[PDB]
Paper text:
In order to better understand the mechanism of inhibition by PCP, we determined the structure of SULT1C2 bound to PAP and PCP. The structure reveals that the protein undergoes a disorder–order transition upon PCP and PAP binding. PCP is found in the substrate binding pocket and therefore appears to be a competitive inhibitor, consistent with crystallographic analysis of SULT1E1 bound to PAP and 3,5,3′,5′-tetrachlorobiphenol. Comparison of the SULT1C2-PAP-PCP and SULT1E1-PAP-estradiol structures revealed two structural features that may be relevant in explaining the mechanism of PCP inhibition. In the co-crystal structures, the phenol moieties of PCP and estradiol share the same relative position and orientation, positioning the phenolic OH within hydrogen-bond distance of the catalytic histidine. Our structure shows that PCP appears to be in a catalytically competent conformation. However, PCP and estradiol differ dramatically in the acidity of their hydroxyl groups; the estimated pKa for estradiol is approximately 15, whereas that for PCP is 4.5. Thus, although PCP appears to bind in a catalytically competent conformation, the phenolic oxygen of PCP may be too weak a nucleophile to attack the sulfonate of PAPS.
Cytosolic sulfotransferases (SULTs) comprise a family of enzymes that catalyze the transfer of a sulfonate group from 3′-phosphoadenosine 5′-phosphosulfate (PAPS) to an acceptor group of the substrate. In doing so, SULTs modulate the activities of a large array of small endogenous and foreign chemicals, including drugs, toxic compounds, steroid hormones, and neurotransmitters. As expected, all SULTs share the same basic fold: a central four-stranded parallel β-sheet surrounded by α-helices and three loops that are often disordered (dashed lines) in the absence of PAP and/or substrate. The crystal structures of SULT1C3 bound to PAP, apo SULT1C2, a ternary complex of SULT1C2 bound to PAP, and the environmental toxin, pentachlorophenol (PCP), and SULT4A1 were solved at 3.2, 2.0, 1.8, and 2.2 Å, respectively.
Numbering used by the authors:
A (entry chain A): 16 to 291, 294 to 302
B (entry chain B): 15 to 302
Write the structure that this text describes.
Amino acid sequence: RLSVNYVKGILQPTDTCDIWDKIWNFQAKPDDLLISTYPKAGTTWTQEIVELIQNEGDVEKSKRAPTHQRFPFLEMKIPSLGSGLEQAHAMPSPRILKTHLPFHLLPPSLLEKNCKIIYVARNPKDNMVSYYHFQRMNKALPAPGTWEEYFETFLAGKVCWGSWHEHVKGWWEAKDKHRILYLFYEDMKKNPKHEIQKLAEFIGKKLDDKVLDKIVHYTSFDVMKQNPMANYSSIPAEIMDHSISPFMRKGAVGDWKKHFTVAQNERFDEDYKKKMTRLTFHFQF
Amino acid sequence: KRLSVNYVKGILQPTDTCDIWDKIWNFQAKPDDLLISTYPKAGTTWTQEIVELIQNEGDVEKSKRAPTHQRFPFLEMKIPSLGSGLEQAHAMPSPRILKTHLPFHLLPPSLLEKNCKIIYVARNPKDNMVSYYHFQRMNKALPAPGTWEEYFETFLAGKVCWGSWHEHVKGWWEAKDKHRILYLFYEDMKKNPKHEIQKLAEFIGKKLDDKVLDKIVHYTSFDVMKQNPMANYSSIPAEIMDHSISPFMRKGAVGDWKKHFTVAQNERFDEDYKKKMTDTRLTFHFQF
Ligand SMILES: Nc1ncnc2c1ncn2[C@@H]1O[C@H](COP(=O)(O)O)[C@@H](OP(=O)(O)O)[C@H]1O
Ligand SMILES: Nc1ncnc2c1ncn2[C@@H]1O[C@H](COP(=O)(O)O)[C@@H](OP(=O)(O)O)[C@H]1O
Ligand SMILES: Oc1c(Cl)c(Cl)c(Cl)c(Cl)c1Cl
Ligand SMILES: Oc1c(Cl)c(Cl)c(Cl)c(Cl)c1Cl
Ligand SMILES: Oc1c(Cl)c(Cl)c(Cl)c(Cl)c1Cl
């Protein structure tokens, strides 16, 4: 596995730590769209939707290259994948950018330029489960240990990008005074058309029902799982082993119930209440 | 090596194919017999220890004379190298303190005809399931439990020795209305041991002073009994029980099930439980 270290208080792959100053001083464009998420909150889904909205349903164009090549992952720097920062550097407008950075670590240019930001939050228990399996299959990230160990690791924020709680909280507090659309993975799953419409309005695109319906179809889990440009199948096998756990794993809400013991659930809820707001009303515990 | 299990009168038993049921059913009780009755793992060993110390007014010496299984005849038991509970009962001087796991409808009628005092102990089914799971892992007289996920469904289905937990606790709860049964709960015993000891003493008919009550509370605590070689099942042939797999005195805690059940298992359990428990007020009693 690739090594990780602390940069500005959060675990990151070693190569990200080494280029922090470069990341911090990222140069945004006023017309950049930023997709911001805690890892495994629904980044790939949201990116696919946002591009399809921007290109008005042009499914052929979204198949031009895989997700990681289409969308610069700002803080990412991994051997065989290059630097997301430099991917963006070279890229002409309109850019659709990705980050998992907690809000306090966000390159200030993105705020200075008042870029439209889409933040997606996900139920933390499903988020833990998704991140657990991701660490099992992704060798750029630390070994997760046993489920029992990982539960504690996640709870304490000792995973890359830090505390889930701090992450969702900082971004929620930020939405009040910045150009942020704050969405929930669960709302997207329950009524994708409604959330896609909300996205389009925020992006400033008027779409008719036909195109909206088309985006709902192409961005459904069962369709995206089969799309070799959207399912992370194109990542070198030396980094992501889909036979351990596929990137497009389940795409469901409530998978956490199959993983959490009642004891873990009670400990999680107790811990949550201590760390955590109106944000709480948007999750089902 | 695991011992074969067989159906006897509709329930699995850790016993051979030579049917000796009639002898058990025709067991000859005495009016001063005390009976401790439990679903497997509901708190038999604990209750026996309390009951004898009450009967002997706190005489801990007497209770150390031999281990649990030799002090207390296990009526339906017939296991290679363990002998026969029936023969052990026949040989046991009065006043006997007897043990059974039989569901109420299979109870030898002499225990009823003689109006014997019976102490039944129920335990919440989730902790009961977990306790029985680990007991089957360690105890070679019982079936191999399979995986935890398999055993969960086996237990839910009542396909374990002594049958359905649900039917067991319900039958005994209904029985208490017509027969001389003191119906106790493991969780009450754990939460206020002194209170349940006083209740038992009054039922058995012993007027114990405060010092004796406190003494029994001390000696029947999990931590003390766990270290007591006459009360912890250490003396069972190593070929029957392997305590290195799981000790008989495992945790002695209410809510240990929470470390075993996933939330999904819990929801499946709770729905199953509702469907099986609509006709009993027992449910207003179980603590988890
Ligand atoms: N179209 C879609 N609908 C719902 N979930 C999707 C999706 N595409 C990807 N996902 C899920 O979102 C998670 C990945 O998030 P990210 O893109 O932020 O890394 C995975 O969750 P699971 O591991 O629960 O399946 C993945 O299956
Ligand atoms: N003094 C005591 N206090 C609480 N629990 C006790 C106890 N003595 C034994 N037990 C528990 O009762 C269960 C055994 O029941 P039985 O005697 O009917 O076979 C075991 O539960 P656990 O497996 O949950 O530890 C055992 O640890
Ligand atoms: O979201 C991602 C994270 Cl957190 C890592 Cl570490 C990697 Cl390698 C990839 Cl590809 C994605 Cl998509
Ligand atoms: O309660 C018991 C049961 Cl059910 C069996 Cl099968 C055995 Cl072998 C023993 Cl020792 C006890 Cl205590
Ligand atoms: O002998 C004992 C008596 Cl009588 C009491 Cl009351 C208590 Cl609490 C303890 Cl610990 C012992 Cl050892």
